[PDB]
mmCIF file of C-alpha atoms and ligand atoms in Angstrom:
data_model
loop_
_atom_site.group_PDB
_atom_site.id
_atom_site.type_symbol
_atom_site.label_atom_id
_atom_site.label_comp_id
_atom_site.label_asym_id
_atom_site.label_seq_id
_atom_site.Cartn_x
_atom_site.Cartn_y
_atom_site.Cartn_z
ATOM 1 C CA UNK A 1 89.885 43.765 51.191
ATOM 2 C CA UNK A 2 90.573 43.015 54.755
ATOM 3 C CA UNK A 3 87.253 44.375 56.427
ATOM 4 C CA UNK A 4 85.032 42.681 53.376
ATOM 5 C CA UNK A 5 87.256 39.213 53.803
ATOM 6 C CA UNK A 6 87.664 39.547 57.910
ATOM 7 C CA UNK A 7 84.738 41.232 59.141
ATOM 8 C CA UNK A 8 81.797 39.326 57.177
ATOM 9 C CA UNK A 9 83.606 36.108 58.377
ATOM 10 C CA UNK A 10 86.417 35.301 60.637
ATOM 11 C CA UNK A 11 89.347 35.139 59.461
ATOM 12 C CA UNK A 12 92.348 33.161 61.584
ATOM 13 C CA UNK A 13 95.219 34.468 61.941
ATOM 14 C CA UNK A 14 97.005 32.623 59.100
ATOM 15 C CA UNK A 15 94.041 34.689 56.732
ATOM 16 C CA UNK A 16 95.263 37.779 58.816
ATOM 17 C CA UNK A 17 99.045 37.290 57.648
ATOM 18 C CA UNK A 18 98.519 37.350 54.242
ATOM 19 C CA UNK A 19 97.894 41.357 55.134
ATOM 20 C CA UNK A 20 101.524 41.880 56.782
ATOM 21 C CA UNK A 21 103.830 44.156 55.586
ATOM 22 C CA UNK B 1 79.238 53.335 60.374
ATOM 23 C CA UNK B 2 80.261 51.141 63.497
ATOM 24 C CA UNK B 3 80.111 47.901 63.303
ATOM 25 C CA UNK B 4 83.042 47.956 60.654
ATOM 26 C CA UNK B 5 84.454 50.272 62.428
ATOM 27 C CA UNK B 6 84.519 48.322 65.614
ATOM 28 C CA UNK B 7 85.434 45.375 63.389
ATOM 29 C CA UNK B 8 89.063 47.241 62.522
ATOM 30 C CA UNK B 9 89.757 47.908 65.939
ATOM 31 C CA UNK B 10 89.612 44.595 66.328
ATOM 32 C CA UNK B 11 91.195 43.894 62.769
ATOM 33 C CA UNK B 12 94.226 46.182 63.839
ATOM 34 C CA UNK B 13 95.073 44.211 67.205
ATOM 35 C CA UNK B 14 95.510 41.321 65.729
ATOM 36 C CA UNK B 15 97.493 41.950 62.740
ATOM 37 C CA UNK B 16 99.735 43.887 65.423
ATOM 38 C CA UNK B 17 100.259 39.954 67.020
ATOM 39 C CA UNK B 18 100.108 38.260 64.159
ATOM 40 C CA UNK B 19 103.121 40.447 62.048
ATOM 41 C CA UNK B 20 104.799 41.363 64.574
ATOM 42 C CA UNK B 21 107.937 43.006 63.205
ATOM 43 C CA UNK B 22 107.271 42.385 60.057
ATOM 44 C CA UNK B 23 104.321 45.390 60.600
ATOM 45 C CA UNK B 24 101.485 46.317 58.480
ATOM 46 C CA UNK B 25 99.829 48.704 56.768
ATOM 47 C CA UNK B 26 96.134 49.624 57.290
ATOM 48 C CA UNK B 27 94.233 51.600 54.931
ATOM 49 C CA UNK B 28 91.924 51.155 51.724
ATOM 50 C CA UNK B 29 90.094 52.921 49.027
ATOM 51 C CA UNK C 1 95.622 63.500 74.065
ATOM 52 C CA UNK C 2 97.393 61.192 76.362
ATOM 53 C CA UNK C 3 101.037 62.067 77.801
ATOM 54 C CA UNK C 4 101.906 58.244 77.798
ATOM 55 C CA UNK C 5 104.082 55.630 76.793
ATOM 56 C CA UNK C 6 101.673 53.969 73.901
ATOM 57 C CA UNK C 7 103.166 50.426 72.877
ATOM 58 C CA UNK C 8 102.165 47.316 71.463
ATOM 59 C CA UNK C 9 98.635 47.040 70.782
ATOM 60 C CA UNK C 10 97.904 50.289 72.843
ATOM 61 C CA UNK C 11 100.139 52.376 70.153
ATOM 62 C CA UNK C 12 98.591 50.843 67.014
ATOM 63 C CA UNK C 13 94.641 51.403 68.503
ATOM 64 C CA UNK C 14 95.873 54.845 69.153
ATOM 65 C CA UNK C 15 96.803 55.078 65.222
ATOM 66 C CA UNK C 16 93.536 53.613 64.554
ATOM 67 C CA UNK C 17 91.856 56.124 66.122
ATOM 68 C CA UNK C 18 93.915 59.040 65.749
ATOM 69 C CA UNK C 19 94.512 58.647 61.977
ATOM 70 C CA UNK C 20 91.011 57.715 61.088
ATOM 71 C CA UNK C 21 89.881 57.361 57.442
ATOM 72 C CA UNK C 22 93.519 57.671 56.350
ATOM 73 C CA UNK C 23 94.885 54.708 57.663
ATOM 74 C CA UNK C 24 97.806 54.266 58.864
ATOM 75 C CA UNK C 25 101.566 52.178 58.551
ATOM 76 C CA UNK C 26 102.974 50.002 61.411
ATOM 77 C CA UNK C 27 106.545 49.338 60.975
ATOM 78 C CA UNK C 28 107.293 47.699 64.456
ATOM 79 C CA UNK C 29 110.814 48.310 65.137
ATOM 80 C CA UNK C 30 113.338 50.429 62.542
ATOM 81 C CA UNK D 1 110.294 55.047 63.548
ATOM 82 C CA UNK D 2 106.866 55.206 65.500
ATOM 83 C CA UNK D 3 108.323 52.416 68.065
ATOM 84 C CA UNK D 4 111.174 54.109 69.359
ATOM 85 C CA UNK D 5 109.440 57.858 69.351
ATOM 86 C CA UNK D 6 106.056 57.224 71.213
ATOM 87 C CA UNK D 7 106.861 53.638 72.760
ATOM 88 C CA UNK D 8 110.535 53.972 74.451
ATOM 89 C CA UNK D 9 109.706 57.960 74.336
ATOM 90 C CA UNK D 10 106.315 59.724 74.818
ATOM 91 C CA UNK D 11 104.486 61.018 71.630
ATOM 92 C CA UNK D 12 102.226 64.103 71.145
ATOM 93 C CA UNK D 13 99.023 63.758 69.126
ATOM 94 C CA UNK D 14 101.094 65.854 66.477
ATOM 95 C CA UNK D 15 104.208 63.216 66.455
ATOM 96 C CA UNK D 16 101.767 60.222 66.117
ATOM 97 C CA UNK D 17 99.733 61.482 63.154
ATOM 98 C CA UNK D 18 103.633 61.398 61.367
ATOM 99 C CA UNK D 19 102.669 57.491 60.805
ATOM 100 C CA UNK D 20 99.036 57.750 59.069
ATOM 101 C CA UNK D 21 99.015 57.719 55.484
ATOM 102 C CA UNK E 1 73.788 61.023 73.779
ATOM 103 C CA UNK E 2 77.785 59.494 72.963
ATOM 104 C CA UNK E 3 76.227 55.631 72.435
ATOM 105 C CA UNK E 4 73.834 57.317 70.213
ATOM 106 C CA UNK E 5 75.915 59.461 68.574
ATOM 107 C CA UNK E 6 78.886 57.385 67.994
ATOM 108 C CA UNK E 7 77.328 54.188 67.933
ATOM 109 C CA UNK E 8 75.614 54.302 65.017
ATOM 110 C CA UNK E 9 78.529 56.367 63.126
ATOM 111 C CA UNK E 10 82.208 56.704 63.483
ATOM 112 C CA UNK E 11 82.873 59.767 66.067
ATOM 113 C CA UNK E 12 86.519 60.782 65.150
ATOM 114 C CA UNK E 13 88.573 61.952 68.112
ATOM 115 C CA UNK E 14 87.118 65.552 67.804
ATOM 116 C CA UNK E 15 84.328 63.981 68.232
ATOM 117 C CA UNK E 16 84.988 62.594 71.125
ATOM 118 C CA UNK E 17 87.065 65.651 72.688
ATOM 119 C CA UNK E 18 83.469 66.747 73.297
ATOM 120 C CA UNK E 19 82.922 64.278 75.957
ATOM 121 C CA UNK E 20 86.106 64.793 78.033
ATOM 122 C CA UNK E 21 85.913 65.880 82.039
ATOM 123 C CA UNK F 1 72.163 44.234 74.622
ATOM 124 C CA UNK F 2 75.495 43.676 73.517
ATOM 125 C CA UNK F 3 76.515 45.331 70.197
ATOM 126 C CA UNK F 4 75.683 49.009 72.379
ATOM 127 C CA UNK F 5 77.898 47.368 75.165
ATOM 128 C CA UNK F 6 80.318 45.965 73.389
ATOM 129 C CA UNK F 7 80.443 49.905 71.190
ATOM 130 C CA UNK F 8 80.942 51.525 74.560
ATOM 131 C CA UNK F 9 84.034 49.156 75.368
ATOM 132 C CA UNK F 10 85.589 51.192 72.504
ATOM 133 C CA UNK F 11 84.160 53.986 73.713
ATOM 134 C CA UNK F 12 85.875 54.238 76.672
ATOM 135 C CA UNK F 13 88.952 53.599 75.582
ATOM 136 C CA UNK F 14 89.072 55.847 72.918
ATOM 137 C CA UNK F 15 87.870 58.353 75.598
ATOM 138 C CA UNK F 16 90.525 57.424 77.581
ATOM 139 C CA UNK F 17 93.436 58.293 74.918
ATOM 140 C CA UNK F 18 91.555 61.390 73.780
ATOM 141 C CA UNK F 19 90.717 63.242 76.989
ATOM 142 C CA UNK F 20 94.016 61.938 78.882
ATOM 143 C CA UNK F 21 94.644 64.182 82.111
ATOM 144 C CA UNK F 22 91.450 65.568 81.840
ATOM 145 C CA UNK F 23 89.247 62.256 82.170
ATOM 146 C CA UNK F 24 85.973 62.136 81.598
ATOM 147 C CA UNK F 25 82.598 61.152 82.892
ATOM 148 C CA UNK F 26 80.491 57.885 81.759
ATOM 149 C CA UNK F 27 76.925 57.118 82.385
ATOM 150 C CA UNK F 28 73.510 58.377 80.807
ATOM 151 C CA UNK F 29 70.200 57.738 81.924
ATOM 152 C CA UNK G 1 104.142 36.026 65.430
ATOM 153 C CA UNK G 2 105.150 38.827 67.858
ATOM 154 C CA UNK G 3 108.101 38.337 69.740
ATOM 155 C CA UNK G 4 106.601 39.967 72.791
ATOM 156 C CA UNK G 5 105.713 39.358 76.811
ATOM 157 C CA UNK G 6 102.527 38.657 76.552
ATOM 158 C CA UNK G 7 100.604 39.248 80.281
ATOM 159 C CA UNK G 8 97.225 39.644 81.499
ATOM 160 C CA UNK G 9 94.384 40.447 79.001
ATOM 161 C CA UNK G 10 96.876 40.473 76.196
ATOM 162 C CA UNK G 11 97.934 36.889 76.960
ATOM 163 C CA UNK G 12 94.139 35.975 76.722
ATOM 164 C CA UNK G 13 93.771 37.967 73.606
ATOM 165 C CA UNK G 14 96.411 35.772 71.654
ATOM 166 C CA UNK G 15 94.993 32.476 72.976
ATOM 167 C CA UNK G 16 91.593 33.543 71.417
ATOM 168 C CA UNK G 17 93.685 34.212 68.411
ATOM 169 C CA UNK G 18 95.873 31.521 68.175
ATOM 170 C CA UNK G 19 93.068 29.010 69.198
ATOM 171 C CA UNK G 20 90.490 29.739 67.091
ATOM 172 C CA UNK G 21 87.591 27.368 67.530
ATOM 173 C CA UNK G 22 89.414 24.857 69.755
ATOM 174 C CA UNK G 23 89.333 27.537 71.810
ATOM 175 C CA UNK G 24 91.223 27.372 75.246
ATOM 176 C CA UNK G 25 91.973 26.523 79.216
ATOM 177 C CA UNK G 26 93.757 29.920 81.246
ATOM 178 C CA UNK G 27 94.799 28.591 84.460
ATOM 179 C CA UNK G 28 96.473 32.183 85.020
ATOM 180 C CA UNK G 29 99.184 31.148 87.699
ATOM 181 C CA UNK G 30 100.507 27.670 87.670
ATOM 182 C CA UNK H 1 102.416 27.466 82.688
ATOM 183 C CA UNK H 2 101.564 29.794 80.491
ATOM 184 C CA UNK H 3 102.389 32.931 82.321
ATOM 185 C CA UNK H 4 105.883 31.986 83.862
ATOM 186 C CA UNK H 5 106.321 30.731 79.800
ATOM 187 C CA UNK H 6 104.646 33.671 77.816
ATOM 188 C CA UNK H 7 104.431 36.421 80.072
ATOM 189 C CA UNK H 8 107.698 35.958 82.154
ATOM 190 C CA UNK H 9 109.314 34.930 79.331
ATOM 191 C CA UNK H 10 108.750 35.116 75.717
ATOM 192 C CA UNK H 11 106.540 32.887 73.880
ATOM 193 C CA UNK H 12 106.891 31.226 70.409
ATOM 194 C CA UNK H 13 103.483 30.983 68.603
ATOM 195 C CA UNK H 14 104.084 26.963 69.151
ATOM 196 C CA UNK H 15 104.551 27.616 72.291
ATOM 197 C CA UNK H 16 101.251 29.291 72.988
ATOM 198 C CA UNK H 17 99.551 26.839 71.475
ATOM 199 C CA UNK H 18 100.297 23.959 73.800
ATOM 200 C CA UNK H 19 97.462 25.898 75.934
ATOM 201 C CA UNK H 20 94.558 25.321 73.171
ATOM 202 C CA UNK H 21 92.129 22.777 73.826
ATOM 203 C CA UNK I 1 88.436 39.470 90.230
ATOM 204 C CA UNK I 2 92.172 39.831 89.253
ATOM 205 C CA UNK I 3 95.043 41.343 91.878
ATOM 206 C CA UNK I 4 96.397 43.614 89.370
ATOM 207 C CA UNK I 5 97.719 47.112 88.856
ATOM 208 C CA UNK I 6 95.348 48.086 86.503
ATOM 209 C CA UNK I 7 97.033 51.287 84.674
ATOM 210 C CA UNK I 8 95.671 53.073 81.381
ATOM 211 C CA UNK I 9 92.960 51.784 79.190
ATOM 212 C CA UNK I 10 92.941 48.442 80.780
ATOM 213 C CA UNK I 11 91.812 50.414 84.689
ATOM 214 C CA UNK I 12 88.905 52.021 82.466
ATOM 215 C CA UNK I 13 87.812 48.769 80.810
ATOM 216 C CA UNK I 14 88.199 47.523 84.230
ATOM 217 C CA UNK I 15 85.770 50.396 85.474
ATOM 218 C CA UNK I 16 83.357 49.857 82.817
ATOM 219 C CA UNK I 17 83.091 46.177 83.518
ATOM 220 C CA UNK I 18 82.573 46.897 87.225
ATOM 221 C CA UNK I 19 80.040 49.143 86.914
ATOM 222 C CA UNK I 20 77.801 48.346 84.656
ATOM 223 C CA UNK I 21 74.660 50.187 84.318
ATOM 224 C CA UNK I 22 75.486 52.870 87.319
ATOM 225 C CA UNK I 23 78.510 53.908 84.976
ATOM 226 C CA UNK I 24 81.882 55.546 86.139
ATOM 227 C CA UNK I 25 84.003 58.781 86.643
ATOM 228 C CA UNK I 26 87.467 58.900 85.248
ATOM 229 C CA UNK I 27 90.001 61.737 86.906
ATOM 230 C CA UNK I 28 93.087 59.994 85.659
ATOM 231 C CA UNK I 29 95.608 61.480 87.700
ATOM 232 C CA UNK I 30 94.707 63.473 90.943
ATOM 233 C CA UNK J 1 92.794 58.725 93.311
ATOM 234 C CA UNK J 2 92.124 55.744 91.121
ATOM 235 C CA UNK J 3 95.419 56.140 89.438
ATOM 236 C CA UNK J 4 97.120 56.689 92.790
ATOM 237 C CA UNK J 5 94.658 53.153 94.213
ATOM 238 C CA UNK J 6 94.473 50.917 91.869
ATOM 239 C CA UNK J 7 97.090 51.100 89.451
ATOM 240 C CA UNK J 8 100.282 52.116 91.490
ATOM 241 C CA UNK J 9 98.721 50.597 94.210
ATOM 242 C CA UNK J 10 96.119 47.228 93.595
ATOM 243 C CA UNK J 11 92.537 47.772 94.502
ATOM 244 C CA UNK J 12 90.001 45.663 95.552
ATOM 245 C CA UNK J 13 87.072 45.201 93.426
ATOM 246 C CA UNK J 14 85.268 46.858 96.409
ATOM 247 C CA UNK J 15 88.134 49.738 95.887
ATOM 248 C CA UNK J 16 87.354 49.879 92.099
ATOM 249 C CA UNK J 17 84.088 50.437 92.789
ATOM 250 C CA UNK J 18 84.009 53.653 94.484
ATOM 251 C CA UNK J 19 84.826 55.166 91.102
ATOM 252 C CA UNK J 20 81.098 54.063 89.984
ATOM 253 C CA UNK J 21 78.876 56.757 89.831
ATOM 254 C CA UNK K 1 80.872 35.067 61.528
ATOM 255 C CA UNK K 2 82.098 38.131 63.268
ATOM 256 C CA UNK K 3 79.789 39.582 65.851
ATOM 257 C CA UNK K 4 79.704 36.592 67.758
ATOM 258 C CA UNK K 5 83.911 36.067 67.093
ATOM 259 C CA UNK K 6 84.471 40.286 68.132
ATOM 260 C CA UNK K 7 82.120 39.795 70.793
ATOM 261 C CA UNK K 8 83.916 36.876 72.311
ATOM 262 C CA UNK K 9 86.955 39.176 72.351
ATOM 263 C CA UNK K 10 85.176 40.725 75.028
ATOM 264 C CA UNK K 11 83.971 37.897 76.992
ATOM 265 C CA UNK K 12 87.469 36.567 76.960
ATOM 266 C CA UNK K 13 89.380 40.121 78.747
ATOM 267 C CA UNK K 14 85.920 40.534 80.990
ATOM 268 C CA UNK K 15 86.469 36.204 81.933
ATOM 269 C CA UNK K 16 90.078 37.383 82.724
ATOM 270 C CA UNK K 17 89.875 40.267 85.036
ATOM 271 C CA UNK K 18 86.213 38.983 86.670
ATOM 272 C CA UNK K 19 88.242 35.303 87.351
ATOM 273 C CA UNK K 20 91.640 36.412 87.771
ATOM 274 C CA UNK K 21 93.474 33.713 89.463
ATOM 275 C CA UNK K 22 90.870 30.718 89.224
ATOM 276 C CA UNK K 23 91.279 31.292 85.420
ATOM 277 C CA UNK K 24 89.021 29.931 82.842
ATOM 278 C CA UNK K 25 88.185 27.480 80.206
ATOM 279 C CA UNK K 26 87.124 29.337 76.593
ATOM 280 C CA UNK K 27 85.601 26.620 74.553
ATOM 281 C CA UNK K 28 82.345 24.753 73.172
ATOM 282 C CA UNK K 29 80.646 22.835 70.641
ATOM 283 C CA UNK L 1 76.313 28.861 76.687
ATOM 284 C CA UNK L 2 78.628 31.821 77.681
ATOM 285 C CA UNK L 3 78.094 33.357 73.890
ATOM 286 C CA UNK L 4 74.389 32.495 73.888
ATOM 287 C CA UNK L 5 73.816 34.116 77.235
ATOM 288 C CA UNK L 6 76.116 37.215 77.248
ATOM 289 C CA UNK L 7 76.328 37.735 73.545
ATOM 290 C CA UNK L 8 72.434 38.164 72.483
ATOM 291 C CA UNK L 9 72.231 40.680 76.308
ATOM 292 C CA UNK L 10 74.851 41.979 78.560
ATOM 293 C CA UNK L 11 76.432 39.557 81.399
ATOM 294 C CA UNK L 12 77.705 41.503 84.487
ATOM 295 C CA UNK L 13 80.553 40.176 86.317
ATOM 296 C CA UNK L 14 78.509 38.366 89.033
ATOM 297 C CA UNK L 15 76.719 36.543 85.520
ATOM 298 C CA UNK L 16 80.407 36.142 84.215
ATOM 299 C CA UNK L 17 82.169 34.610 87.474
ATOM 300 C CA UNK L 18 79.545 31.765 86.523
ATOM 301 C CA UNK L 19 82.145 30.418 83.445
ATOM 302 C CA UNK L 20 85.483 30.655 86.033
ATOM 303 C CA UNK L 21 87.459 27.817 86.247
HETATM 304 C C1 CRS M 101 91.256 38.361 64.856
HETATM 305 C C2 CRS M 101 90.112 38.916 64.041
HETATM 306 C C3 CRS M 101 89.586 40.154 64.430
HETATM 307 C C4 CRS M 101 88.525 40.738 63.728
HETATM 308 C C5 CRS M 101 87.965 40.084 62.641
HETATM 309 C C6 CRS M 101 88.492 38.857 62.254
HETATM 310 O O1 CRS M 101 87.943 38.264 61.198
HETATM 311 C C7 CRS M 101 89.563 38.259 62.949
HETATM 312 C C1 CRS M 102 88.759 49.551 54.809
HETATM 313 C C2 CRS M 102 89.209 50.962 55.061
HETATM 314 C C3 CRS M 102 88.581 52.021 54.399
HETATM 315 C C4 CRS M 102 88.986 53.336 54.619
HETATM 316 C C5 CRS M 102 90.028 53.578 55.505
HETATM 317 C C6 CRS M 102 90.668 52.523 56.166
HETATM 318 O O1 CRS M 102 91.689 52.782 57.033
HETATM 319 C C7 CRS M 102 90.259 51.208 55.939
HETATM 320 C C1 CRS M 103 86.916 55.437 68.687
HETATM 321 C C2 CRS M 103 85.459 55.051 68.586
HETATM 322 C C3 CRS M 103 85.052 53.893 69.260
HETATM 323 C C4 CRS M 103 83.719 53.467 69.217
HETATM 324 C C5 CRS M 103 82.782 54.181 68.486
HETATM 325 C C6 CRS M 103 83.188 55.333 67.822
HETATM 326 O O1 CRS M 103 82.261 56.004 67.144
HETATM 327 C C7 CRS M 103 84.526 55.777 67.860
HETATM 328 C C1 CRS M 104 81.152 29.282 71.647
HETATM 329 C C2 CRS M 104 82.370 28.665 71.021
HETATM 330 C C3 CRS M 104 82.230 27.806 69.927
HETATM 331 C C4 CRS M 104 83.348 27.224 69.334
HETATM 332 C C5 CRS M 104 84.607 27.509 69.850
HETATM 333 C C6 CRS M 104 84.755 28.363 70.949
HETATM 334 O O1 CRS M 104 85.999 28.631 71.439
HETATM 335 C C7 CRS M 104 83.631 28.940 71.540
HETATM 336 C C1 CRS M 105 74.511 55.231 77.546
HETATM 337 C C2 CRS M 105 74.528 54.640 78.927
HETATM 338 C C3 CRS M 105 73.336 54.205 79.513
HETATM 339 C C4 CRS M 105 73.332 53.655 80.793
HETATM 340 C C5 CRS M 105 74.535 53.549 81.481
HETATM 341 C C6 CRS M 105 75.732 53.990 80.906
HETATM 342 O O1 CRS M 105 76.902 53.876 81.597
HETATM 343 C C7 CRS M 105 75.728 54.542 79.624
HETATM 344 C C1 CRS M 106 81.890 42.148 79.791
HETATM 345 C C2 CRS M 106 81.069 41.568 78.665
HETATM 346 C C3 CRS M 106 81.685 41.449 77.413
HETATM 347 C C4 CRS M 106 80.993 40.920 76.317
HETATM 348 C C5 CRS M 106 79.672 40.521 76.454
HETATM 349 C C6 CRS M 106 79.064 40.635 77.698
HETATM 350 O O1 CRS M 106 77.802 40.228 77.800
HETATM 351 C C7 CRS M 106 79.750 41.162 78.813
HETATM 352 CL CL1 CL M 107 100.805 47.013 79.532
HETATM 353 CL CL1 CL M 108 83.039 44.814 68.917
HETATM 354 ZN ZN1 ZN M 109 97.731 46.644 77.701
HETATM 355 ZN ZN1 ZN M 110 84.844 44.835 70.194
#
């Protein structure tokens, strides 16, 4: 999810948008 | 469980720039 | 708990924290 | 919503746990 | 102590109630 | 020594929203 | 994107965000 | 510069971005 | 180091920062 | 205080550090 | 590549209050 | 550099103030 994808790796912030909403 | 759990804080910030007022939720499992 | 005006990133780390293994929503404005 | 109850007013503890899932 | 205790796992706010004054 | 310091930046500020008005104390050792 | 001030550490913040590894110059006041 | 732009005013990601390397 | 009004969470990172090993005390309001 | 110092007022970094154990 | 990313999040707030008006340059490689 | 250095162990300020400017 989001900690698996973002916190192994970075993800930028256009990774991070695909989480909004 | 920290590190993760420090990760989110961190997670949490930025998706709070990054939406904006679009907004977000935050939760799994 | 805090007596404060929590916005911005301040109000959604206080979610984080406050609201645990939950999680939480962030609307922004309504 | 959250914004205009804890940001533009002040929030208990109680008020702010309203917005976890 | 706190860095041991919540270091090394999550210390929820009641948790952390404990340390206050 | 960082991943201890960089916990206790959270620390504190999660100590900070919790204990409010009452404040708290932080140092060991 | 936020439509926000953005001041002090939270300025900083959303360079390092924005940035990524370019990374970044803060001259604070110009 | 970026504070009388961003902070005194309101920023536009593009806009923030003029102050990457 | 910054000339600031350092209020909130950002006065207690600022504490943290400053003292380093010695540590801090926090009254909030007196 | 430190409330009363540094944050209605601005404090020194010799000021903040008082509040060091 | 996190640790090193969340701790620069750090470095980045401590580079801003310790430098305050001299500001800073974050960047390398 | 600054992430070698204050990443691996803890820079103070006086270690920080070293990357200013
Ligand atoms: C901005 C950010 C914070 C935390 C983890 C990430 O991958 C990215
Ligand atoms: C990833 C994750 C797990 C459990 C709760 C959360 O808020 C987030
Ligand atoms: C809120 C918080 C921050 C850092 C560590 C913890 O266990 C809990
Ligand atoms: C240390 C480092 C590497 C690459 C980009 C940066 O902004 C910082
Ligand atoms: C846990 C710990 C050790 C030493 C100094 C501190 O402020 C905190
Ligand atoms: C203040 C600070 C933040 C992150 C790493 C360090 O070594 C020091
Ligand atoms: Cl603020
Ligand atoms: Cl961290
Ligand atoms: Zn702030
Ligand atoms: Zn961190």
């Amino acid at each position: 999810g989001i900690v698996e994808q973002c916190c192994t790796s970075i993800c930028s912030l256009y990774q991070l948008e695909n989480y909004c909403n | 469980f920290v590190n993760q759990h420090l990760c989110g804080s961190h997670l949490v910030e930025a998706l709070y720039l990054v939406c904006g007022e679009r907004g977000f939720f935050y939760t799994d499992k």
